[PDB]
Symmetry: D2
Subunit: 121 residues, 4 copies
């Protein structure tokens, strides 16, 4: 299992110790407060009112927690994933990333606390 | 495991099929958008700027997801719990509740989607 | 989880720290060598060739590993149970017992080593 | 998870669908009756009284259940493995095999029923 934090200002994301293998079932729980720039802060589902101006993940709100598995496209995580199995052919290290517009991460603040574990399978 | 919705305007909360027994380890993941009155909506951690005017749970923000286990007092859930063990002397059905001031649930809206499972022990 | 031993000569069995509750999923793995009297020893499935002369459990061979859950009747364990849910409405402490005829345990020898855990559910 | 049978006469062993990956925790439960030649049958621990005459696994009895994980040497399984991590960083597909002397499998009979699952990690 992996426990840590995902900084909002980290454009490269956080490479975890979890290697998703075919057949794996995972659970993720995410908490905390972060911002894409404004003085306000949002939780891991991000800001529902904010327009998409070129986000790395178009299926999640700006300020949401998202992930990649190996070299996959981004997959929304939000508050977490419960006993989740990935799409076929998706495998490798899980990287967690804050959802913002490329090149605009420098003014972000805060972080999400995240736990990931493999479940029974 | 249980999957269901908790409505924000439901002052009695949503009883689940999960009975928490001594020694149990549980995982909860919660998602969605709800409000305690205003046109704005918040996720399961609720509204970090809102003052506590007599909430059912003082250790969570207004509009947060909380729970009771049997006849316990309220316990914060927020976005969820990872491989969590209850305090001693707490046992019984898990009821999920939106955190608001008693008698003020009528103007709430939206809901949280919630998964609960028991883990290895 | 619980690890321990159950003696072939003990009519009372071995009370474990595992309390089986409704909906629990359990796994048991059992090993070792025991006898109900003969110089030969058998593993936890017991002696497939031996007639039932009034065994405490009629659904397992003589010299098998069996259990009770609370005040239940005996339930076969044999070499173990994989991700098992109790079929009956049973609840309570797991007691492990060697399957022999009451009052004939005096000539028994050996023991089974047993691990029990609760699985995800 | 995988459930299947391992025939005592199958010198090549039974390939499962489980790939053991780094960090995995597994549980195996095995049951049934088999023989390496004699009219008697034994369970998955094999025959504790039989000498080792060149068995594939010298750390398990003749007629025991054993396995290989990828290009590992043989590893004893017996009645099973409880929440087990593979030693010395071995990895790859799990193959289940009956423990007998090479070239003497032809007179073997019976089989073991085996469940394998991955546990929380
Ligand atoms: Ca920004
Ligand atoms: Ca309200
Ligand atoms: Ca006896
Ligand atoms: Ca043979
Ligand atoms: Cl005992």
């Amino acid at each position: 299992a992996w426990k840590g934090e995902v900084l909002a200002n980290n454009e490269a994301g956080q490479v975890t110790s979890i290697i998703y293998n075919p057949g794996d079932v995972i659970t993720i729980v995410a908490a905390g407060w972060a911002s894409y720039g404004p003085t306000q802060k949002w939780g891991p589902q991000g800001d529902r009112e904010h327009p998409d101006q070129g986000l790395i993940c178009h299926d999640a709100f700006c300020g949401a927690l998202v992930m990649k598995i190996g070299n996959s496209g981004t997959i929304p995580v939000n508050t977490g994933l419960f006993r989740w199995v990935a799409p076929n052919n998706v495998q490798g290290a899980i990287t967690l990333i804050y959802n913002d517009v490329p090149g605009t991460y420098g003014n972000n603040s805060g972080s999400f606390s995240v736990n990931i574990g493999k479940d029974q399978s």
